[PDB]
Design a protein around this ligand. Structure first.
Ligand SMILES: [Mg+2]
Ligand SMILES: [Mg+2]
Ligand SMILES: [Mg+2]
Ligand SMILES: [Mg+2]
Lengths: 114, 199, 72, 193
RNA sequence: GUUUUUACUAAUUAUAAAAAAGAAAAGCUUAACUGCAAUACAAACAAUUAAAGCAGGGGCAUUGUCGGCAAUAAUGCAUUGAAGAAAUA
RNA sequence: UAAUGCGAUAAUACGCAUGACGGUUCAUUUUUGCCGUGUGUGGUCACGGUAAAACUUAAGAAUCGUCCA
RNA sequence: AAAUACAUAGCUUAGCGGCUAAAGCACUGGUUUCAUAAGCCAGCUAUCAACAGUUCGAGUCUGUUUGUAUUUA
RNA sequence: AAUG
C-alpha cells in the first residue's frame, strides 16, 4: 500500500547522527536534476551560539533543538518561504527531530507531511 | 523446549608459521620520533604513529610539538582543521595517562607545545608537568639548553611567573646567551620576564 | 499499574553490623535474622595459613569420643 | 527523606568488584568483562497449591501480589498457551534490571538464602543459543522453596499463607564459563561444584 | 473507515507482496453512501475488470484519506412472482 | 560521512580512535564452454546473448582480530 | 484392475469432536454345598488395523500402505 | 434339590 510519489519544489530533510541533528531546505526544478540548498542549520551551530551566552549540556539537548528551529524560521522568513513538505524516513522518527518539528509549527512555519 | 549451544573452540596459530612474508622492519623510539617530525600535512601527522605500541608518551609529545609548527607555518581549510583537532584531543589524553613515564625533555617540550596551541587546555597537564619539574634539580641538571629554553619561554607565555622557578632560570638563561645556545628562545623569555618585572 | 512505595528497615547481623534494606512496610524495631552470611558455614573463605596446614597434616587418632558413653 | 533510594550492591560492583575482575582476567578492551544483565522471577502453577496446568487469572492475583511485595514492581501474567484460551493463564513473572536488580540480590543473599535448609550452592551456568545479534549468554537457575522467610508477609499471615516457592534466573554476559563463576563468586553466591 | 503510540515484522488452499508499509494495542465512527463520469484492460456477442474527476450529505484528521475487506475463487440471463415508495387514470 | 561510526548503565559531556599486518564478505568483451534465432543430408555456416547457470588473475571497500612485526 | 461397505479387552457388542469409554459372556477372588454345577457378592483387562495430515483437542474428520466381504470385467 |  505504498502511495504514489508527488513532486514538490520545496522539501525539508533531517539527518540525525550520533552527535548532532542537521536540517536542510532544498529547492527542486525536476526530479532529474540536483537541487539547491537554501537553508543549512545544525545543532553544531546552535551549540556554539548558546554556549557563549547560556551554558548548555550538549548539542543534543532540548535547548539546542529549539534554537535550531528558531534559526530555521528566520532564514525561511527572510527568503519568503512559508510552506514546506517534510521528507519522511527512519531519521524522521528520532526524538530530537520530532522536537524541532514541533517548535517550527508553533513558530509559524507550515510543515506538511502529505 | 529450550535448546543449548556449544561455543566452537578457539584456533591458536601453529608455531613456526610466519605471520607475513613481507618485509616489515622493526622500529625503535628514535625512528618513530624522526618519522613523526618528518610530516608535512595533518593527515601524515595523524598516521605517523598509530596503535598502542607506537602511540606512546614520547610519540604524543612529538605530535603536539610538530602540530604547533605546522599550525603556525600554514593555513588550513575545514577538513584539515578537523584533523588537527583530532590530533590534539588524542595526544593530550594519552599524556594524561602516561605522564609519570615522561622524561625531562618531553615535559619541557609538552609545556611549550601546550602554550602555543590555541585549543582548550586539558585538565591539569601544565600543572602536573610543573610539579614533577618543581624539584629544582632537573632544571639544574638539564644539560640541553633547548629544554630549559622551551620551559622558560612556555611559562612566560602562559604567565606563570613563578618566583622560585624564574630565579633559577635567570642565571641559566644568561649562561645560555653567553654560550650562544638557544639565543632566540632565551632572549625571548628574558625579555618577557623583564617586561613583567617592569610591569 | 502503580508501583508501591519502598521504605527502609534496619537489619542487625551476627557481628553487630547494621544494614538498611528496602521493605514495603515500616518496622520500628530492628529485625534480627536467625542466620546470616557470617554465621552460616557455607559462606566461609578457603584461604588457610601455614599453621592450619601443619595441624591438618599431623593428626593422631583419638577414640575417646566413642568410649565416653560406656564410661558414663 | 527517610526512604530507601540508593543501592549498596550497585556501588560495590562498579567501584570495587569490577577492577578486581580485570586484574584476575586481563582483557584487551575495558568493556570486555563479566556483566549481570537481568534477573527474572517466575511463579508457575506447579509451584503453588493449585493443581492444574491452566488456571484463571483471578486465582493467580495473590501470587502476582506476592511478587510485588518481594520486588517492589508490578508483575505480569504469562501469555496464554494458545489463541483459543484467552482468560486463563499459567503463572506470573517479573523482570528487573539496574538498581532494583541489585537491591533484590543483596536482600536475598544476606538474609533469605542462609536461612534456607537445603542450600549448598547455585548450579553451574548453561549457555543459550545466540540470538540474531550473535552474543553468547549464560544463565544460572535456582529456586527458593521457602517464601515465608521475608519479613514482609507477616502483616497479613492468613492472606499470604498459600505462598510456597519461587524460581530465579540470572543472565550473565562473559567470554567463558570460568568468567561467569568469577562474577558469581564476587556476588557472594556459593556455586555447587 | 480514519488518527496516535512501538523492545513486533507474521499468516493464508498456495505464493520471494509490502518499512512511511503492515500487525497488534488505545480512541472516535458507518464511505459496507445518493446522482453522474473522461479514458483504458479484456473480449464473437452477452455480460466481466480498473478508474482520474464533478455535485450533495457525512466520518476521522486539520487539509490528507474513505464509493467495503493485501491481491488472485465464494456464482446465475430473460421471464414469472412478491415487497417499499412515488406519478397517472 | 571525524558535525562519521561503534559501546557491556548506552543516554552520549565520557570510552575506543583515520596507519600498519592477518583472516572473512563483496582486463585486447579476463576467455573458454554453453544457450537462442536463422539456414541446414542431421553442422568445414552466420550473428547475437549469458546484469540467467560452470570457469582467471588482481586491485580496492565494509566489518573483525591485534602493545605492531 | 474398477465400485460400495468394514477393521473396536480373551470373544460378541456401545461410540463417530470436550479428555481415551458402555453392556453381556470369558477370566480372578470370596460365599453357598459332604463335594462339583446352577444361584449370589466383589474385582480385572492404558479398551479403540498401521502411517502421514487437519484442528486449541480426533476411537470419531481427510489421504496412503495392509486385511475382509459385496457387485462388475 | 441337576450330578457323583
Ligand atoms: Mg462487448
Ligand atoms: Mg474531507
Ligand atoms: Mg478501500
Ligand atoms: Mg454329566
Amino acid at each position: 500500500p505504498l502511495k504514489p510519489l508527488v513532486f514538490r519544489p520545496l522539501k525539508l530533510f533531517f539527518w540525525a547522527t550520533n552527535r548532532h541533528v542537521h536540517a536542510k531546505v532544498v529547492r527542486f526544478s525536476s526530479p532529474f536534476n540536483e537541487g539547491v540548498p537554501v537553508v543549512d542549520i545544525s545543532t553544531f551551530d546552535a551549540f556554539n551560539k548558546l554556549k557563549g551566552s547560556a551554558p548548555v549540556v550538549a548539542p543534543r539537548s532540548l535547548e539546542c533543538y529549539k534554537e535550531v528551529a528558531k534559526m530555521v524560521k528566520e532564514e525561511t522568513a527572510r527568503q519568503n518561504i512559508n510552506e514546506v513538505t517534510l521528507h519522511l524516513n527512519s531519521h524522521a522518527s528520532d526524538r530530537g527531530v520530532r522536537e524541532v518539528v514541533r517548535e517550527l509549527k508553533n513558530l509559524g512555519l507550515l510543515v506538511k507531511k502529505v | 523446549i529450550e535448546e543449548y549451544y556449544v561455543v566452537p573452540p578457539a584456533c591458536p596459530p601453529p608455531p613456526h608459521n610466519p605471520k607475513t612474508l613481507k618485509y616489515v622492519p622493526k622500529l625503535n623510539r628514535t625512528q618513530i620520533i624522526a618519522r613523526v617530525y618528518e610530516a608535512k600535512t595533518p593527515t601524515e601527522l595523524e598516521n605517523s604513529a598509530l596503535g598502542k605500541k607506537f602511540f606512546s608518551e614520547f610519540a604524543a609529545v612529538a605530535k603536539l610539538v610538530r602540530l604547533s609548527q605546522l599550525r603556525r607555518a600554514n593555513v588550513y581549510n575545514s577538513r584539515d582543521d578537523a584533523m588537527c583537532v583530532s590530533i590534539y584531543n588524542t595526544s593530550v589524553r594519552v599524556a594524561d595517562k602516561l605522564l609519570h613515564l615522561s622524561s625531562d625533555e618531553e615535559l619541557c617540550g609538552l609545556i611549550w607545545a601546550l602554550s602555543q596551541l590555541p585549543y582548550p587546555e586539558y585538565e591539569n597537564l601544565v600543572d602536573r608537568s610543573l610539579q614533577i619539574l618543581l624539584e629544582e634539580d632537573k632544571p639544574l641538571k638539564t644539560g640541553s639548553s633547548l629544554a630549559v629554553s622551551r620551559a622558560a619561554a612556555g611559562l612566560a607565555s602562559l604567565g606563570r611567573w613563578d618566583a622560585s622557578t624564574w630565579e633559577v632560570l635567570v642565571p641559566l638563561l644568561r649562561k645560555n646567551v653567553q654560550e650562544g645556545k638557544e639565543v632566540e628562545l632565551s632572549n625571548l623569555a628574558l625579555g618577557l620576564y623583564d617586561a613583567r618585572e617592569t610591569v | 499499574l502503580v508501583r508501591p512505595l519502598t521504605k527502609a528497615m534496619t537489619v542487625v547481623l551476627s557481628n553487630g553490623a547494621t544494614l538498611r534494606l528496602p521493605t514495603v512496610y515500616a518496622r520500628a524495631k530492628p529485625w534480627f535474622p536467625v542466620m546470616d552470611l557470617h554465621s552460616h558455614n557455607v559462606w566461609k573463605h578457603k584461604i588457610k595459613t601455614d599453621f592450619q596446614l601443619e595441624s591438618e597434616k599431623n593428626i593422631t587418632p583419638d577414640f575417646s569420643n566413642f568410649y565416653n558413653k560406656f564410661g558414663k | 527523606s527517610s526512604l530507601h533510594l540508593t543501592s549498596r550492591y550497585h556501588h560495590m560492583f562498579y567501584n570495587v568488584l569490577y577492577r578486581e575482575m580485570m586484574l584476575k582476567a586481563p582483557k584487551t578492551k575495558v568493556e570486555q568483562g563479566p556483566h549481570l544483565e537481568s534477573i527474572t522471577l517466575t511463579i508457575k502453577t506447579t509451584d503453588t497449591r493449585l493443581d492444574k496446568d491452566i488456571v484463571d487469572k483471578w486465582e493467580l492475583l495473590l501470587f502476582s501480589l506476592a511478587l510485588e511485595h518481594i520486588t517492589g514492581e508490578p508483575a505480569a501474567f504469562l501469555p496464554p498457551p494458545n489463541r483459543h484460551v484467552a482468560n486463563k493463564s499459567a503463572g506470573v513473572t517479573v523482570t528487573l534490571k539496574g538498581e532494583k536488580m541489585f537491591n533484590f540480590l543483596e536482600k536475598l543473599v544476606y538474609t533469605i538464602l542462609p536461612n534456607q535448609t537445603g542450600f549448598e550452592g547455585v548450579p553451574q551456568p548453561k549457555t543459550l543459543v545466540p540470538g540474531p545479534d550473535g552474543v553468547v549468554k549464560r544463565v544460572v537457575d535456582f529456586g527458593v522453596t521457602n517464601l515465608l522467610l521475608y519479613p514482609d508477609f507477616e502483616e497479613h499471615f492468613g492472606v499470604f499463607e498459600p505462598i510456597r516457592s519461587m524460581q530465579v534466573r540470572m543472565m550473565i554476559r562473559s567470554d567463558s564459563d570460568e568468567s561467569c563463576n568469577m562474577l558469581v563468586s564476587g556476588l557472594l553466591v556459593p556455586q555447587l561444584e
